[PDB]
CSV table of C-alpha atoms and ligand atoms in Angstrom, one decimal:
chain,number,residue,atom,x,y,z
A,1,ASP,CA,5.1,-21.4,-8.0
A,2,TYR,CA,2.6,-19.5,-8.6
A,3,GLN,CA,0.5,-19.0,-12.1
A,4,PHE,CA,-1.4,-16.0,-13.2
A,5,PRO,CA,-4.1,-17.6,-15.5
A,6,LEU,CA,-4.4,-16.0,-19.4
A,7,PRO,CA,-8.1,-16.2,-20.5
A,8,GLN,CA,-8.4,-19.7,-22.0
A,9,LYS,CA,-7.2,-21.4,-18.1
A,10,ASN,CA,-11.2,-20.8,-18.0
A,11,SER,CA,-12.4,-22.7,-20.8
A,12,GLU,CA,-16.5,-22.3,-19.8
A,13,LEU,CA,-16.1,-18.5,-19.8
A,14,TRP,CA,-13.4,-18.7,-21.6
A,15,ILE,CA,-15.9,-19.7,-24.8
A,16,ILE,CA,-17.6,-16.3,-23.9
A,17,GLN,CA,-15.2,-14.8,-24.6
A,18,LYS,CA,-13.8,-16.4,-27.7
A,19,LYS,CA,-17.2,-15.4,-29.4
A,20,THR,CA,-17.7,-11.8,-29.1
A,21,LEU,CA,-14.1,-11.2,-29.5
A,22,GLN,CA,-14.4,-13.0,-33.1
A,23,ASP,CA,-18.1,-11.2,-33.6
A,24,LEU,CA,-16.2,-7.6,-33.5
A,25,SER,CA,-12.7,-8.7,-34.6
A,26,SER,CA,-14.2,-10.1,-38.3
A,27,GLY,CA,-16.6,-7.0,-37.9
A,28,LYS,CA,-19.8,-10.0,-37.3
A,29,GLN,CA,-20.8,-7.6,-35.0
A,30,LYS,CA,-20.1,-3.4,-35.6
A,31,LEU,CA,-19.8,-1.2,-32.4
A,32,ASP,CA,-21.7,1.6,-33.7
A,33,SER,CA,-21.3,3.7,-29.5
A,34,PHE,CA,-19.6,4.3,-27.1
A,35,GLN,CA,-22.7,2.4,-25.3
A,36,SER,CA,-22.2,-0.7,-27.3
A,37,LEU,CA,-18.1,-1.2,-26.4
A,38,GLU,CA,-19.9,-1.3,-22.7
A,39,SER,CA,-21.9,-3.6,-23.3
A,40,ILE,CA,-18.9,-5.7,-24.9
A,41,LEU,CA,-16.6,-5.3,-21.2
A,42,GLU,CA,-19.3,-6.3,-19.6
A,43,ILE,CA,-20.0,-9.6,-21.2
A,44,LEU,CA,-15.7,-9.9,-21.0
A,45,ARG,CA,-16.5,-8.9,-17.5
A,46,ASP,CA,-18.7,-12.1,-17.0
A,47,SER,CA,-20.6,-9.3,-15.5
A,48,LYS,CA,-24.6,-8.6,-16.0
A,49,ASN,CA,-25.4,-5.7,-13.6
A,50,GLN,CA,-23.5,-2.0,-14.2
A,51,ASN,CA,-24.0,1.8,-13.9
A,52,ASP,CA,-22.3,4.4,-15.5
A,53,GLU,CA,-19.8,5.1,-12.8
A,54,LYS,CA,-17.9,1.6,-14.1
A,55,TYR,CA,-16.3,3.2,-17.8
A,56,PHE,CA,-16.0,6.9,-16.4
A,57,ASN,CA,-13.5,7.4,-17.2
A,58,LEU,CA,-12.9,5.4,-20.7
A,59,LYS,CA,-15.5,7.1,-21.8
A,60,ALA,CA,-14.0,10.6,-21.1
A,61,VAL,CA,-11.0,9.5,-23.2
A,62,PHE,CA,-13.0,8.5,-25.9
A,63,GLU,CA,-15.3,11.8,-25.7
A,64,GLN,CA,-12.0,14.0,-25.9
A,65,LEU,CA,-11.4,12.8,-29.4
A,66,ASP,CA,-11.7,13.8,-32.5
A,67,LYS,CA,-15.3,12.1,-34.3
A,68,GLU,CA,-13.0,11.4,-37.0
A,69,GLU,CA,-11.1,9.3,-34.3
A,70,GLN,CA,-13.4,7.7,-32.5
A,71,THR,CA,-15.0,6.6,-35.4
A,72,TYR,CA,-12.1,4.5,-35.3
A,73,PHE,CA,-11.6,3.5,-31.8
A,74,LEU,CA,-15.3,1.5,-32.5
A,75,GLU,CA,-14.5,0.5,-36.1
A,76,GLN,CA,-11.1,-0.3,-35.6
A,77,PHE,CA,-9.0,-0.3,-32.9
A,78,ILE,CA,-11.5,-2.4,-30.1
A,79,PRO,CA,-12.0,-5.3,-33.7
A,80,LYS,CA,-8.5,-5.1,-33.6
A,81,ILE,CA,-7.2,-6.1,-30.1
A,82,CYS,CA,-9.7,-8.5,-29.3
A,83,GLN,CA,-8.2,-10.0,-32.3
A,84,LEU,CA,-4.5,-9.6,-31.1
A,85,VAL,CA,-6.4,-11.2,-28.3
A,86,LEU,CA,-7.1,-14.4,-30.1
A,87,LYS,CA,-3.7,-14.8,-31.2
A,88,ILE,CA,-2.6,-16.1,-27.2
A,89,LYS,CA,-1.6,-19.4,-27.1
A,90,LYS,CA,-0.3,-19.8,-23.4
A,91,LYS,CA,-3.3,-20.9,-20.5
A,92,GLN,CA,-1.3,-19.3,-18.0
A,93,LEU,CA,1.9,-17.2,-16.9
A,94,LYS,CA,5.0,-18.8,-14.8
A,95,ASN,CA,5.2,-16.8,-12.0
A,96,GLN,CA,8.4,-18.0,-10.0
A,97,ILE,CA,10.7,-17.7,-7.5
A,98,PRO,CA,14.2,-18.0,-8.0
A,99,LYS,CA,16.5,-19.4,-6.2
A,100,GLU,CA,20.1,-18.7,-4.3
A,101,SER,CA,21.6,-16.6,-7.2
A,102,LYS,CA,19.2,-17.8,-9.6
A,103,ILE,CA,16.9,-16.0,-12.1
A,104,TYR,CA,14.3,-16.4,-13.9
A,105,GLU,CA,13.8,-14.8,-16.6
A,106,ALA,CA,10.4,-14.6,-18.8
A,107,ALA,CA,11.4,-13.7,-22.1
A,108,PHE,CA,8.4,-12.6,-24.7
A,109,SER,CA,8.7,-11.4,-28.2
A,110,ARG,CA,7.6,-7.1,-29.0
A,111,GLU,CA,3.9,-8.5,-30.5
A,112,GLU,CA,3.0,-11.1,-27.6
A,113,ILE,CA,3.5,-8.5,-25.1
A,114,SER,CA,0.8,-5.9,-26.8
A,115,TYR,CA,-2.0,-9.4,-26.1
A,116,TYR,CA,-1.3,-9.1,-23.0
A,117,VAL,CA,-1.6,-5.4,-23.1
A,118,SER,CA,-4.9,-6.1,-25.4
A,119,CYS,CA,-6.1,-8.1,-23.0
A,120,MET,CA,-5.3,-5.1,-20.1
A,121,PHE,CA,-7.3,-2.6,-21.7
A,122,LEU,CA,-9.9,-5.0,-22.5
A,123,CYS,CA,-10.8,-6.3,-18.9
A,124,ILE,CA,-10.4,-9.6,-18.5
A,125,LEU,CA,-6.7,-11.0,-16.3
A,126,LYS,CA,-8.5,-11.6,-13.0
A,127,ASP,CA,-7.8,-14.4,-10.9
A,128,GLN,CA,-10.3,-15.5,-9.5
A,129,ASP,CA,-10.4,-17.7,-6.9
A,130,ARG,CA,-7.3,-15.3,-5.1
A,131,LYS,CA,-10.1,-12.5,-6.5
A,132,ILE,CA,-7.2,-10.8,-7.2
A,133,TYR,CA,-6.9,-8.7,-11.2
A,134,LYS,CA,-4.2,-6.7,-13.2
A,135,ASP,CA,-6.3,-5.7,-15.6
A,136,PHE,CA,-7.7,-1.5,-16.4
A,137,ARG,CA,-10.7,-2.4,-14.8
A,138,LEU,CA,-10.5,0.5,-11.6
A,139,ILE,CA,-8.1,3.0,-13.8
A,140,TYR,CA,-11.3,3.0,-15.9
A,141,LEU,CA,-13.8,3.5,-12.8
A,142,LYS,CA,-15.0,7.1,-11.6
A,143,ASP,CA,-13.6,7.9,-8.2
A,144,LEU,CA,-15.4,11.0,-6.4
A,145,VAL,CA,-11.6,12.5,-6.2
A,146,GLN,CA,-11.3,14.7,-9.8
A,147,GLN,CA,-7.5,15.0,-9.8
A,148,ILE,CA,-8.1,10.1,-9.9
A,149,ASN,CA,-10.0,10.7,-11.9
A,150,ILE,CA,-7.3,12.7,-14.2
A,151,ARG,CA,-4.6,10.7,-14.0
A,152,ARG,CA,-6.7,7.4,-14.4
A,153,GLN,CA,-7.6,9.9,-17.7
A,154,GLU,CA,-3.9,10.1,-18.7
A,155,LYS,CA,-3.3,6.9,-17.8
A,156,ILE,CA,-5.7,4.9,-20.6
A,157,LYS,CA,-4.5,8.1,-23.6
A,158,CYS,CA,-1.2,6.1,-22.8
A,159,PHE,CA,-1.7,2.6,-22.8
A,160,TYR,CA,-4.1,3.8,-26.0
A,161,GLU,CA,-0.9,5.3,-27.4
A,162,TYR,CA,1.2,2.0,-27.2
A,163,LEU,CA,-1.8,-0.7,-28.4
A,164,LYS,CA,-1.9,2.3,-31.7
A,165,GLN,CA,1.3,2.2,-32.7
A,166,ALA,CA,1.6,-1.9,-31.5
A,167,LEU,CA,-1.6,-3.1,-34.0
A,168,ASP,CA,1.2,-1.0,-36.2
A,169,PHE,CA,4.4,-3.6,-35.8
A,170,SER,CA,6.5,-4.4,-38.7
A,171,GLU,CA,7.2,-7.9,-39.8
A,172,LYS,CA,10.4,-7.2,-38.0
A,173,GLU,CA,9.8,-5.0,-34.9
A,174,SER,CA,6.9,-7.5,-33.7
A,175,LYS,CA,9.4,-10.6,-33.3
A,176,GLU,CA,11.6,-8.0,-31.1
A,177,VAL,CA,12.4,-10.2,-28.0
A,178,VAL,CA,11.9,-8.3,-24.2
A,179,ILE,CA,13.4,-10.7,-21.0
A,180,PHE,CA,12.4,-9.7,-17.3
A,181,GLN,CA,13.6,-11.2,-14.9
A,182,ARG,CA,13.6,-11.6,-11.2
A,183,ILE,CA,17.6,-12.1,-10.6
A,184,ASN,CA,18.9,-13.7,-6.8
A,185,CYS,CA,21.9,-12.1,-6.2
A,186,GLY,CA,22.8,-13.9,-3.1
A,187,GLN,CA,23.7,-13.5,0.9
A,188,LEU,CA,22.8,-10.3,1.9
A,189,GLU,CA,26.4,-8.5,3.3
A,190,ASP,CA,26.3,-6.8,6.9
A,191,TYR,CA,26.9,-3.9,7.7
A,192,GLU,CA,31.0,-4.5,9.5
A,193,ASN,CA,31.6,-6.1,5.8
A,194,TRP,CA,30.2,-3.6,3.5
A,195,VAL,CA,33.0,-1.6,5.4
A,196,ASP,CA,35.5,-3.9,5.3
A,197,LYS,CA,35.3,-4.7,1.6
A,198,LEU,CA,35.2,-1.0,0.7
A,199,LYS,CA,38.6,-0.5,1.9
A,200,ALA,CA,40.1,-1.3,-1.6
A,201,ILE,CA,38.1,1.2,-3.3
A,202,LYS,CA,38.0,4.8,-4.2
A,203,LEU,CA,35.0,6.9,-4.6
A,204,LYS,CA,34.4,7.2,-9.6
A,205,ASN,CA,32.9,9.7,-11.1
A,206,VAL,CA,29.9,11.5,-10.8
A,207,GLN,CA,28.0,13.7,-13.3
A,208,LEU,CA,25.4,15.3,-12.0
A,209,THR,CA,22.2,16.6,-14.6
A,210,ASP,CA,19.1,18.9,-12.8
A,211,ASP,CA,16.9,19.7,-16.0
A,212,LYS,CA,16.9,16.1,-17.1
A,213,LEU,CA,15.5,13.2,-16.0
A,214,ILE,CA,16.5,9.6,-15.8
A,215,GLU,CA,14.5,8.4,-19.2
A,216,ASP,CA,16.9,10.8,-20.9
A,217,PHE,CA,20.2,9.0,-20.6
A,218,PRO,CA,19.9,5.8,-23.2
A,219,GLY,CA,22.7,3.4,-23.2
A,220,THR,CA,23.1,3.6,-18.7
A,221,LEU,CA,21.5,1.4,-16.5
A,222,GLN,CA,18.0,3.4,-15.7
A,223,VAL,CA,16.2,2.6,-12.5
A,224,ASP,CA,12.9,2.1,-11.9
A,225,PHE,CA,12.1,3.4,-8.3
A,226,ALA,CA,10.6,0.3,-7.8
A,227,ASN,CA,7.8,-0.3,-5.0
A,228,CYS,CA,8.7,-4.3,-3.4
A,229,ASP,CA,5.3,-4.9,-5.3
A,230,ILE,CA,6.9,-4.4,-9.3
A,231,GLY,CA,5.0,-1.5,-10.6
A,232,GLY,CA,3.3,-0.3,-8.0
A,233,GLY,CA,0.2,1.9,-8.3
A,234,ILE,CA,0.8,1.4,-11.7
A,235,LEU,CA,-3.5,-0.9,-11.9
A,236,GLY,CA,-4.3,1.9,-9.3
A,237,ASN,CA,-3.4,5.8,-8.8
A,238,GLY,CA,0.0,5.7,-8.8
A,239,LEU,CA,1.3,8.3,-10.6
A,240,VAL,CA,5.1,9.4,-9.0
A,241,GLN,CA,8.8,7.7,-11.0
A,242,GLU,CA,7.9,4.6,-10.9
A,243,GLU,CA,4.2,4.4,-12.5
A,244,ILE,CA,5.4,7.5,-15.1
A,245,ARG,CA,8.0,4.6,-16.4
A,246,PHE,CA,5.2,2.3,-17.2
A,247,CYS,CA,2.7,4.2,-18.9
A,248,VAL,CA,5.4,5.8,-21.1
A,249,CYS,CA,6.9,2.3,-21.6
A,250,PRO,CA,4.0,0.3,-20.8
A,251,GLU,CA,5.7,-3.2,-22.1
A,252,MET,CA,7.0,-3.2,-18.4
A,253,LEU,CA,3.1,-3.9,-17.2
A,254,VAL,CA,4.5,-7.4,-18.1
A,255,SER,CA,6.6,-8.0,-15.4
A,256,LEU,CA,3.3,-7.3,-13.0
A,257,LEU,CA,2.1,-10.1,-14.6
A,258,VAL,CA,5.2,-12.4,-14.2
A,259,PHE,CA,6.4,-11.3,-10.1
A,260,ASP,CA,3.1,-12.1,-8.4
A,261,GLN,CA,5.0,-11.8,-5.2
A,262,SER,CA,7.5,-9.1,-3.1
A,263,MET,CA,11.8,-8.0,-3.7
A,264,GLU,CA,12.7,-9.7,-1.8
A,265,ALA,CA,16.2,-7.7,-0.3
A,266,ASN,CA,18.2,-9.7,-1.8
A,267,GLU,CA,16.8,-9.6,-5.1
A,268,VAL,CA,17.0,-6.7,-7.8
A,269,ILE,CA,14.9,-6.7,-11.4
A,270,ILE,CA,16.3,-6.4,-14.8
A,271,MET,CA,14.2,-5.1,-18.1
A,272,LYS,CA,15.5,-5.5,-21.6
A,273,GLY,CA,14.9,-4.1,-24.4
A,274,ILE,CA,11.6,-1.7,-23.1
A,275,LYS,CA,10.9,0.6,-25.6
A,276,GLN,CA,9.0,4.3,-25.0
A,277,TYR,CA,5.7,5.1,-27.4
A,278,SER,CA,4.5,8.2,-25.4
A,279,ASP,CA,6.2,11.9,-24.2
A,280,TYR,CA,4.9,13.6,-20.5
A,281,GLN,CA,4.7,16.9,-19.0
A,282,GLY,CA,4.1,17.0,-15.4
A,283,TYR,CA,4.1,14.2,-12.2
A,284,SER,CA,1.3,13.5,-10.0
A,285,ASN,CA,-1.2,15.2,-10.9
A,286,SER,CA,-0.3,18.2,-13.2
A,287,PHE,CA,1.1,14.7,-15.6
A,288,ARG,CA,-0.3,14.3,-18.8
A,289,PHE,CA,0.3,12.9,-21.6
A,290,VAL,CA,2.6,13.9,-25.0
A,291,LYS,CA,2.4,12.2,-28.4
A,292,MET,CA,5.6,12.1,-28.9
A,293,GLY,CA,6.6,13.6,-31.6
A,294,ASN,CA,9.6,13.0,-34.7
A,295,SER,CA,12.3,14.5,-34.1
A,296,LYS,CA,15.6,12.7,-33.5
A,297,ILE,CA,15.6,11.9,-30.1
A,298,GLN,CA,12.0,11.4,-29.8
A,299,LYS,CA,12.5,8.9,-32.9
A,300,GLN,CA,14.8,7.5,-30.5
A,301,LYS,CA,12.6,7.2,-27.5
A,302,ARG,CA,9.9,4.6,-29.5
A,303,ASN,CA,13.1,2.9,-31.8
A,304,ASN,CA,16.1,2.5,-29.4
A,305,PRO,CA,15.4,-0.3,-26.8
A,306,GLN,CA,16.1,0.3,-23.4
A,307,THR,CA,17.3,-1.7,-20.0
A,308,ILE,CA,15.5,-0.7,-16.6
A,309,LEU,CA,16.7,-2.4,-13.1
A,310,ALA,CA,13.8,-1.8,-10.7
A,311,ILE,CA,15.0,-1.8,-7.1
A,312,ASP,CA,13.5,-1.1,-3.8
A,313,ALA,CA,14.3,1.3,-0.9
A,314,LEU,CA,13.0,1.3,2.0
A,315,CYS,CA,9.6,3.5,2.4
A,316,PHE,CA,10.0,4.7,5.9
A,317,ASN,CA,8.1,7.0,8.7
A,318,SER,CA,9.3,10.2,9.4
A,319,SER,CA,10.4,8.6,12.6
A,320,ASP,CA,12.8,5.7,11.5
A,321,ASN,CA,16.4,5.8,11.8
A,322,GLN,CA,17.9,6.4,8.4
A,323,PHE,CA,20.9,6.2,9.1
A,324,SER,CA,20.9,3.2,11.1
A,325,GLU,CA,23.7,0.9,10.3
A,326,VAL,CA,20.8,-1.7,9.4
A,327,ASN,CA,18.6,0.0,7.7
A,328,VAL,CA,22.0,1.0,5.3
A,329,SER,CA,23.4,-1.2,4.9
A,330,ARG,CA,19.8,-2.3,3.4
A,331,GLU,CA,20.6,0.0,0.7
A,332,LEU,CA,23.8,-0.4,0.6
A,333,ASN,CA,23.0,-3.7,-0.4
A,334,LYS,CA,20.2,-3.1,-2.2
A,335,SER,CA,21.2,-0.8,-4.7
A,336,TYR,CA,25.4,-2.8,-5.0
A,337,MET,CA,23.1,-5.9,-6.3
A,338,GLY,CA,21.1,-3.7,-9.1
A,339,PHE,CA,24.2,-1.7,-10.1
A,340,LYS,CA,26.0,-4.6,-10.9
A,341,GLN,CA,23.3,-5.9,-13.4
A,342,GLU,CA,23.7,-5.8,-16.6
A,343,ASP,CA,28.4,-5.1,-16.3
A,344,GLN,CA,28.1,-4.0,-20.1
A,345,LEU,CA,26.1,-0.7,-19.3
A,346,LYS,CA,29.6,0.8,-17.5
A,347,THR,CA,26.2,3.9,-16.2
A,348,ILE,CA,23.7,4.3,-14.3
A,349,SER,CA,21.0,6.5,-14.8
A,350,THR,CA,19.2,7.4,-11.3
A,351,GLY,CA,18.8,10.0,-9.3
A,352,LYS,CA,16.4,10.9,-6.0
A,353,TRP,CA,15.9,7.0,-5.7
A,354,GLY,CA,13.4,6.6,-2.0
A,355,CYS,CA,13.3,10.0,-1.5
A,356,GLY,CA,9.9,11.2,-2.5
A,357,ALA,CA,6.9,8.9,-1.9
A,358,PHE,CA,9.2,6.4,0.4
A,359,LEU,CA,10.5,9.7,2.6
A,360,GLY,CA,14.2,9.2,2.4
A,361,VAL,CA,16.7,11.5,3.2
A,362,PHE,CA,19.0,12.4,-0.4
A,363,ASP,CA,22.4,13.5,1.1
A,364,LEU,CA,22.5,10.2,2.3
A,365,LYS,CA,20.4,8.4,-0.7
A,366,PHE,CA,23.5,10.4,-2.9
A,367,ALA,CA,25.9,8.5,-0.1
A,368,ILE,CA,24.8,5.1,-0.9
A,369,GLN,CA,23.8,5.1,-4.2
A,370,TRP,CA,27.4,7.0,-5.4
A,371,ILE,CA,29.3,4.2,-3.0
A,372,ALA,CA,27.5,1.1,-5.5
A,373,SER,CA,27.9,2.2,-8.5
A,374,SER,CA,32.1,3.1,-7.1
A,375,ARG,CA,32.1,-0.6,-5.8
A,376,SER,CA,30.4,-2.2,-8.6
A,377,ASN,CA,33.2,0.3,-10.6
A,378,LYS,CA,30.3,2.3,-12.8
A,379,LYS,CA,29.8,6.1,-13.3
A,380,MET,CA,27.2,7.1,-11.7
A,381,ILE,CA,24.6,9.9,-13.4
A,382,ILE,CA,23.5,11.0,-11.0
A,383,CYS,CA,19.0,13.7,-11.9
A,384,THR,CA,18.7,16.5,-9.0
A,385,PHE,CA,14.9,17.2,-10.2
A,386,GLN,CA,15.4,20.7,-10.3
A,387,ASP,CA,17.5,20.9,-7.6
A,388,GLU,CA,19.9,23.8,-7.6
A,389,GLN,CA,20.8,23.9,-4.0
A,390,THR,CA,20.9,20.1,-4.3
A,391,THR,CA,22.9,20.1,-6.8
A,392,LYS,CA,25.4,22.2,-6.0
A,393,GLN,CA,26.5,20.9,-3.1
A,394,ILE,CA,27.0,16.8,-4.2
A,395,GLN,CA,29.4,19.1,-7.3
A,396,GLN,CA,31.3,20.1,-4.3
A,397,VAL,CA,30.7,16.2,-2.1
A,398,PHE,CA,32.3,14.8,-5.5
A,399,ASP,CA,35.0,17.3,-6.4
A,400,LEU,CA,36.2,16.8,-2.3
A,401,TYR,CA,35.6,12.8,-2.3
A,402,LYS,CA,36.7,11.6,-5.8
A,403,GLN,CA,38.9,9.3,-6.2
A,404,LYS,CA,39.1,8.7,-2.3
A,405,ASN,CA,38.8,5.5,0.4
A,406,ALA,CA,35.2,4.3,0.1
A,407,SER,CA,35.3,2.5,3.4
A,408,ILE,CA,36.6,6.5,5.1
A,409,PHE,CA,33.6,7.8,3.8
A,410,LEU,CA,30.6,5.6,5.0
A,411,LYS,CA,32.5,5.7,8.2
A,412,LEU,CA,32.2,9.4,7.4
A,413,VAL,CA,28.6,9.2,6.4
A,414,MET,CA,27.2,7.7,9.6
A,415,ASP,CA,28.9,9.1,11.9
A,416,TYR,CA,27.1,12.7,10.6
A,417,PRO,CA,23.7,11.8,13.8
A,418,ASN,CA,25.8,12.4,17.0
A,419,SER,CA,28.4,14.5,15.0
A,420,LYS,CA,28.7,18.4,16.5
A,421,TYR,CA,27.2,19.0,12.5
A,422,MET,CA,24.0,17.5,12.8
A,423,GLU,CA,21.0,20.8,14.5
A,424,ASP,CA,22.8,23.0,12.2
A,425,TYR,CA,24.3,20.9,8.7
A,426,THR,CA,22.7,18.5,6.5
A,427,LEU,CA,24.6,15.4,6.2
A,428,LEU,CA,26.5,17.1,2.7
A,429,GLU,CA,27.2,21.1,4.1
A,430,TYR,CA,29.3,18.1,6.7
A,431,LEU,CA,31.3,16.8,4.7
A,432,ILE,CA,31.9,20.4,2.2
A,433,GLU,CA,32.9,21.5,5.5
A,434,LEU,CA,34.7,18.4,7.0
A,435,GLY,CA,36.3,18.1,3.6
A,436,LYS,CA,37.2,21.7,3.1
A,437,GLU,CA,39.1,21.4,6.4
A,438,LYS,CA,41.4,19.3,5.0
A,439,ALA,CA,43.5,21.3,3.7
B,1,APR,N1,12.2,10.8,-14.4
B,1,APR,C1,12.5,10.6,-13.2
B,1,APR,N2,13.6,10.8,-13.7
B,1,APR,C2,14.5,11.6,-12.5
B,1,APR,N3,13.9,11.6,-11.1
B,1,APR,C3,13.0,11.8,-11.0
B,1,APR,C4,11.8,11.7,-12.5
B,1,APR,N4,11.4,10.9,-11.7
B,1,APR,C5,10.9,10.9,-10.2
B,1,APR,N5,12.1,11.8,-10.1
B,1,APR,C6,12.4,12.0,-8.1
B,1,APR,O1,12.6,11.3,-8.3
B,1,APR,C7,11.7,11.4,-6.2
B,1,APR,C8,11.3,10.2,-5.7
B,1,APR,O2,10.5,8.8,-7.0
B,1,APR,P1,9.0,8.6,-5.7
B,1,APR,O3,8.8,8.3,-6.9
B,1,APR,O4,9.0,9.4,-5.0
B,1,APR,O5,10.4,7.3,-5.8
B,1,APR,P2,10.5,6.3,-4.1
B,1,APR,O6,10.3,7.7,-3.1
B,1,APR,O7,11.7,5.6,-3.9
B,1,APR,O8,9.3,5.7,-4.0
B,1,APR,C9,8.9,4.9,-4.0
B,1,APR,C10,7.2,3.6,-5.0
B,1,APR,O9,6.5,5.2,-5.4
B,1,APR,C11,6.0,4.6,-6.2
B,1,APR,O10,4.6,5.0,-6.2
B,1,APR,C12,6.5,3.0,-6.9
B,1,APR,O11,5.9,2.1,-6.8
B,1,APR,C13,6.4,2.9,-4.5
B,1,APR,O12,6.1,2.9,-4.6
B,1,APR,C14,11.0,12.5,-7.3
B,1,APR,O13,10.5,12.9,-5.7
B,1,APR,C15,11.0,13.1,-7.8
B,1,APR,O14,12.7,13.5,-7.0
């Protein structure tokens, strides 16, 4: 059972940090330049030596601010997040692996979350014995590759926006509860077990969207396409589906502090109470922070909490047989164990799960997710991410197989690779051909 150390755990270093934090917070010490801020960060990191690449990306963000916000940043924001850190009472955070069919729940007030993200912003979250850090130090550091520095800068913009919002929390918002759950879902079911269980299951409703994203569907169980280490590359270079979600919803960062151990095959993570603080455009290299406006939709994203399911798909290489009984049952288990959580959210918002960085074939991952949402007795919204061809194929498959037997469907899918259709047809195209023939 691991306890992630907070700054007070190191009693000696804390004595040093606390005084600096107090000086800044009280105005006793006032930052007159970004260079004075670097000196502060160095003290807080217990560093005696630095170069001018150590804070390069933070400086780049600072230098994009106008004169007035630059002054605000040095004279108000930094002092104010120092004061947030000074409100922390805990000395460590428990990282517990739940027993079979049990849950480890870690609950926080919305303001407490902002204390920890402030710690990340000031680079003071580290386990020195393990030589592990859970803060923004790498994001601040200059990389050789320009595109990587831009990614890191845009992350900083999102986190900065979130912290400015947190500093303005009303009493009511500050006290709201955010919940992280690591859920052990019990015994995995093997392929033949699945084949048998599905005999009683009919395929349920699917809605397709080609132009909206998962986070555009409030009041659903929204899927995070997770790494088995929750958060993936958020504290480094990563900027695909999971990392972008953490960027626009930085409260999710606290999951890093309580779920150190990789998710097992029969575990899933649930996050509740999560709000969205930034908007964005682009993806990966083209990702850019966008300040949220005051449209009804944007206000709702900022003000209405959502519940997120984090499930890690298999990370495939190009020669892996994704249609193996072993690999299909793995994904059926993972998706079903996740989808069946929070049974009051009768609709799943998902998409190309495991089919980007993890190299999954979406035809198959759609089928697996459909079987899983169907067995959970839930509806599914599938985001195709501007893939018109796939949208049309899935629509036709849905129309042909809706309400049909899920076990029969599963077996049909599993026969694809060795069928006479494999060379000239994709899985979806195969299903369409077969389904039409049945007619
Ligand atoms: N907000 C979104 N909403 C709906 N669909 C989306 C969204 N963002 C991306 N997609 C689509 O989903 C696909 C899969 O996204 P990935 O992030 O590549 O998911 P995955 O293949 O499961 O890779 C998981 C890995 O990447 C992350 O670093 C994560 O931490 C893990 O290590 C993308 O290629 C894209 O088509």
